[PDB]
Amino acid sequence: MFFIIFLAYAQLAYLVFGTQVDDFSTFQECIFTQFRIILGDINFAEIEEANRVLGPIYFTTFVFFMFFILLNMFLAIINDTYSEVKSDLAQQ
Amino acid sequence: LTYGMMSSNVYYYTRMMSQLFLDTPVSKTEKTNFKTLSSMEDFWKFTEGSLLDGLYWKMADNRSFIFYENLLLGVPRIRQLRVRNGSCSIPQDLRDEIKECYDVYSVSSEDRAPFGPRNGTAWIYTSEKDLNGSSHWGIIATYSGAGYYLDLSRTREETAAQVASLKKNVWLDRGTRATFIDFSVYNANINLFCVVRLLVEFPATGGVIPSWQFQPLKLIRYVTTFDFFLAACEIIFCFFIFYYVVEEILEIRIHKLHYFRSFWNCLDVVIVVLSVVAIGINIYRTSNVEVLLQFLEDQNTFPNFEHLAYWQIQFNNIAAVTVFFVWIKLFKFINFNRTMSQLSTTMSRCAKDLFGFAIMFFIIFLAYAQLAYLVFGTQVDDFSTFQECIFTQFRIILGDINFAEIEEANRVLGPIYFTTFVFFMFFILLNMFLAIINDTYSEVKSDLAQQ
Amino acid sequence: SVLRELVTYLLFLIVLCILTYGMMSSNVYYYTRMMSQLFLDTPVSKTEKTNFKTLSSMEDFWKFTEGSLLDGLYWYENLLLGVPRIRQLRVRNGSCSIPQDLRDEIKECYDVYSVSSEDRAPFGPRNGTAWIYTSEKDLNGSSHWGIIATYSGAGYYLDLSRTREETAAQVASLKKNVWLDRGTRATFIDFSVYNANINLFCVVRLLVEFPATGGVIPSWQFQPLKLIRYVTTFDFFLAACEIIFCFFIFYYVVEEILEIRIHKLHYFRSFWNCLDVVIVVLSVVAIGINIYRTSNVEVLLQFLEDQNTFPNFEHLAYWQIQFNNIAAVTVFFVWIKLFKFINFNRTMSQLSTTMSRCAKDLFGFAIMFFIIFLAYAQLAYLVFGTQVDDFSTFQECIFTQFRIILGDINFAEIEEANRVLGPIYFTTFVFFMFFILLNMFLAIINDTYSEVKSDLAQQ
Amino acid sequence: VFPEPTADVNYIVMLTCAVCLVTYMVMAAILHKLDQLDASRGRFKYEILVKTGWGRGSGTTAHVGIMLYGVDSRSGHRHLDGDRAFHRNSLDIFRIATPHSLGSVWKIRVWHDNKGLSPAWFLQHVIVRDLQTARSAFFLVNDWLSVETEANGGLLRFRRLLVAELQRGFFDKHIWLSIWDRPPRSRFTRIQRATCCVLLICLFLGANAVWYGAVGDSAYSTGHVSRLSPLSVDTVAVGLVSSVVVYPVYLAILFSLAHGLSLLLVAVAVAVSGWVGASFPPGVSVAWLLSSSASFLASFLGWEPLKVLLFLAKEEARKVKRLHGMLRSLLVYMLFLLVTLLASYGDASCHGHAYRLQSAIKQELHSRAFLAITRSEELWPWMAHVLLPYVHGNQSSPELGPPRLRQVRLQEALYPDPPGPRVHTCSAAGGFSTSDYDVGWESPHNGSGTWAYSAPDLLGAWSWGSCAVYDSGGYVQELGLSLEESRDRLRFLQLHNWLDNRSRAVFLELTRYSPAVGLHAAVTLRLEFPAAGRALAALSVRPFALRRLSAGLSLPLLTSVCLLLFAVHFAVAEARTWHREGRWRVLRLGAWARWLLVALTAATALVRLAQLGAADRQWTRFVRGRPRRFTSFDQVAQLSSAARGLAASLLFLLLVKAAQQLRFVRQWSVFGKTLCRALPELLGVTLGLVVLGVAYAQLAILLVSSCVDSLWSVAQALLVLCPGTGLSTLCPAESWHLSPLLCVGLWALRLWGALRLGAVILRWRYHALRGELYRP
């Protein structure tokens, strides 16, 4: 699911910024740029000027969905699995 | 369709022109370029300097190939928009030391009278209809398609003389509000036009604001077999959209009259609406190309290609959003085992609580944003507009911020803002989402296991 | 009964804090920075744009030693503490085996620097001590641990003069009668300055390494030191603080000795005793370094008036660096030690029990995390080892990965070095560290917390 | 007349319409909840016997009640049914569930019910003496009359025919005080009243906007709207005519599913308010609000009162009391929010123009030339090269006063610093000696020379200098006669060295004004120098709108006085509770938060009034003689700025309060409960985090400030820093500020995990709160 959403966002970014920003020149470059956005290693001074509308929307929605939804879901899965396995192992 | 619409690298096509016209210093001894213009004299230096160097290249009245490959089409055009004198209202207290005053740009305050040496079209107002122009939506305001315009020549010697004459007789006063430069190139190697527009804004408070636009176009599509393949694929896409809308109408007709409580029907109707809008835009755009024929009838006039570029940008945005939503629609089918079913159930069950908490999260976010706008909004320029404040906060979340630039804007209440925002964003608001998601996932998994 | 412990620890902590604040604003960083800018930033000559930080050939070094070095040394306006020394370490001809396949066009080879392949024969005009090998013992030096190798203290040395018109002549004579042959491997320059305007002694060492593959590599170190004396009342206040600190550490060590004498059978199960002994040993080694430095600081002023002798003052600089490094971790541990008092309430007790009951699981998972970390580091070393310079050595790979964890990526050199398997490495590392592995830590803690609260109910 | 050819927007009308719509939405939700609660069920009441067996012959199914037409509670008669259900020859003796409260006055009335057979029994009364409040009498007429003939009494004449009726419908047909004072089971739904109320207020707003925007020239043309101050004939005579002029249309719906279409009409109402109000001068938009308020007050006092001339029960009671209190609090908070919004965002266009103006001023003086200065001798050609054309050239046509110049070295000449480097920050200073002087140097010829000391003035004592700061002390210059005398004066100053010698700062600041935007600005440059030659740099441009206290009744004055009224109301309300409880009003948010709110509300108005007065005084001083002095407007440019910040802070608080009020949704009430319950563990973890952050911060800065790129190999990679700066550029020897330390500590805490620990706590608490409020 995570990579389906990631590739949808990457394709949108490729179609929007693919001729002006040089960080979205190719699809693989879009993927690498999206991975670098998580670390906070992007300009955003070129994203906003390449497209004033639909440029900031992409960035804000991507940040909100990656940081506040998917990472928390990974953490929840890991926490629940660890607690369940430890409890059942101790019980048995 | 998407992979065909992004052909071989037109990114380099755009980049070469951008570097030629934007990164080149206006002259040899100074280091300012178009991106760092700071005064009207710098604009005049640019017009007679790097602009003419980039526009005209050497191989009787021969044409100009910009990189020995890109053919300059017709002649470039320059235009300006200005306001009337005495269009503001100064107080009677200072009505002796201040005589003249010009307001900000607006159609109510714009000038329409001849000025200076009234000789030709450069000193006479021309209406928008008689100029076949339209609005632009610049950075400061939205400028009309009218103004005072001049058409340059096909050779450097005549254009230089024209620009020198425009500079001698003062054509840029302090009443000037905006200036546009427009032209186009072809580059027959790959069949793809390029439209170039450069805008320079002169705000009423002084200073200069530059902006640019380089837009590739395709107007002679059917040249190769791949073009016919793309046309056939477009026809197939139209048939698919027709079938989908027919199926949607059948499913909304009688069966499940409500039909809106699925979140998949809403996605389907959104996709259909976007697709039909894109199809209509494409049909209205490709069938209106009389500008190209008029230019080809006589190739010594300005080629009017801005409407095509505007509609191409609109179509690109619509297509990108449609593709994104079509790809998102794939979640309707990934339920092939018990692992994905419980994940989808968890998401669907926790969405209703995530929305309720996101309301509070966004209220607090907007409170912080408005505080930052009101405090740092006149000195930082990362907070100069409300949406810029929102984007700046989203960047602060990622750590892409310069704390020193807001610490010096306000010695106190700046560090307070930064510290409180970071603390309450990473220690409270981020963890409540995790709490909700973890509780819902645990409840769903335990319910399934017990049942 | 813990009130006395809390109050004595509070007095110890405030004493340490005031000592730190006294060391906080010594204003030695700014002087060293703008004196480094005097040597490493000014163009080598009026025409060339290069500096010591960007040396690239033998000629650049030869221009540096006649130019930016001389004019910035004989004129802020500091005065010399003697005569600077310049030393050279070289290897011998025929120190490696030329393959027989292609040896009719190559006649001599020079191996990388090593004690086995070091040269000792008198080369060039055998006039003085700059053309004859002198052992380490006569030079009273030690190893340097440079960038590409570690260098002995021996070599071919020459002491310059206190007058510019003679030092320039000496270095010109060295340049004329060729001194830097193909066998040269390293060059050291050492001196010291005073800068009477603000009382701060400084020792300066510059090193130029000549690899066997050609080129040069520059490195530098400027170290400040002080000759503190009772000249005001504030320095007396800090002196009283130092005596108070000595009394406090003696108090802590004697009662630690008592508490270990009464319970010598078991003393390592508790965690705070280990922290206390670490604190006391760090404090005692730091104070020993300080007393040695203040005892030996009385010999450096002998060269201030007039002395045509080179002062070897590198041990003081090394031990001062060690003293700063020790002081930092000392205050950190004496900031951690504060954590054993705040355990007054029931909630604090639950938090402390949660943290104490999950130490073994965290340590166990650290092993797996480090195994995966070393696997990734070895992969990065094998892939980007010869291209990026953030992965040139194994420790550099380790530190680069640590910086990547904290968000300090470059990704330009990584992508350029390997268009495939570079981005794969980056993406896989980011995905598996920011979404899977680092979460597991928290998971452990999370469970423990719940368990703790649960037993409260059963209690 | 078709107005609005322009494109600027007026924020007052939009803000007030948004506030009214939002308060209507909240009231509609809460009132619908209350209506459904009341309809699900649809003092004066005593616990005494009602055995009225004084007669017989009236055997029939009868169930009547009483009407306690008293003070603040006048309910009608009710009915009840028992086992026998009032069979033949049976007298009912029981008490009914009546929540109306009467008083110890002549307020009693009992109804009857004669269904079928006529009444023959004589039911005297219910003998009650003292049960709850003794609001009844144990005596009556006890007579028989026609069918449904209710006996009158105290505890048909025209003078008393329907005067009692004026105590039933008085708060029923008065649409304002009828949303919480209606009788049970009425055909009004209690939200139709809110619908017609919001329609009425929006229609007042629309009528006032239309009159002030379009129909204002037929009666008196050539700009009749030119007075804003209340002269008892203006801004009042417009409200009543409007008021009345739509009153009838409001009636038209008061007479029914037209409400579903009525919300449409209200829409287009604000539409004209969003259209005709865009071209409103500031003086007109501050009278439009006053006229609307006057019209509403007239309707509340003059026209509506004239129109009227023509167990579980305790739980429900406390619920309805709580809901009424919530309505009152909602209205008060909405009014406070509207006042704060008007105080904050009245001139956002001026905000954007001010930012652009300051940027243009900075870029037009070569700010990065002044920032990168290291020679005290190139300052004079810098001033003679870019500053003189700026001040005297045709570029800055509006200047508003001649420039000025001054500095501080005190009485001690500087010394030649070492070439290249300089003193640490400002070493080898002087002090500050005040005394007269003459041309060339401090050496009087016959008396007090022209080169005076220029001592501090009455107001403006703030410069916030890095090393030292004065108010006005310095060698004041004139720089007049823009033609040629400026260069001559500069050359004379350079030659005579009257102020060149013994200098440690620059402190140059003249003026700025933008006639188009309508904003002034104060630009000041500081070049504090440790000694001769090397110097630091700093620039500060502050734009502001020059509005004066004598200008009239501008929006800031009205907002400030309303804020002061709100502050005093909150203060007295909190003092009433404080005096009720005496002392020991501690250990709760309560008073400790209300006091801070009152302090903020008082300061955000006091600072505004102070800046208005300071601006007026400075403007008068400047107008006295304009081409003689400097007048130092900078002080005003500070105060206004401060005021703005205060306002923002206030709004911020109010906004977060809105989030706290979202708990009223039952399914969304767990987040606030979770936070409130987990607060102690969060505080403990916060204490631990603070200790760890302090330790790490002072380890990191100690490691950093001990070397020049020669720290370590391990610690060079594990050391986090404040975002926005690198590792090479740190350790400023001028001052070790606390804010970089806080940033470093907090960001290091955030990057090393150490902030997901809250997720360990909150999650648990969240789980614990979903077993104690969803399970049972």
Ligand SMILES: CCCCCCCC/C=C/CCCCCCCC(=O)O[C@H](COC(=O)CCCCCCCCCCCCCCC)COP(=O)(O)OC[C@@H](O)CO
């Ligand atoms: C034989 C005896 C054995 C001795 C005991 C053995 C102990 C062995 C150490 C294990 C390290 C434990 C913490 C290391 C965690 C490092 C990474 C981390 O914190 O992960 C977070 C959860 O972790 C966590 O909250 C874990 C707990 C957080 C606490 C962080 C403090 C770090 C170290 C404090 C030093 C104190 C004392 C030091 C000297 C005594 C989740 O990623 P998060 O989204 O949040 O952002 C990260 C993103 O921004 C960049 O990575």
Ligand SMILES: *[C@@H]1O[C@H](CO)[C@@H](O)[C@H](O)[C@H]1NC(C)=O
């Ligand atoms: C602008 O108009 C004013 C009168 O309103 C006049 O004094 C001034 O000279 C005019 N400026 C021009 C024509 O440039």
Ligand SMILES: *[C@@H]1O[C@H](CO)[C@@H](O)[C@H](O)[C@H]1NC(C)=O
């Ligand atoms: C106007 O046009 C005439 C003829 O085309 C030319 O001679 C003159 O220089 C132009 N400019 C003026 C009169 O300012």
Ligand SMILES: *[C@@H]1O[C@H](CO)[C@@H](O)[C@H](O)[C@H]1NC(C)=O
């Ligand atoms: C180094 O030794 C080899 C031994 O074969 C000799 O041929 C060569 O000439 C020597 N190098 C020089 C510079 O003499």
Ligand SMILES: *[C@@H]1O[C@H](CO)[C@@H](O)[C@H](O)[C@H]1NC(C)=O
């Ligand atoms: C080495 O020889 C003499 C030492 O007696 C010295 O003066 C000279 O400068 C040196 N160099 C030569 C002779 O090339």
Ligand SMILES: *[C@H]1O[C@H](CO)[C@@H](O)[C@H](O)[C@H]1NC(C)=O
């Ligand atoms: C080092 O000290 C020794 C003392 O034995 C001295 O002989 C020697 O000259 C010193 N260094 C030098 C110049 O070799």
Ligand SMILES: [Ca+2]
């Ligand atoms: Ca469907």
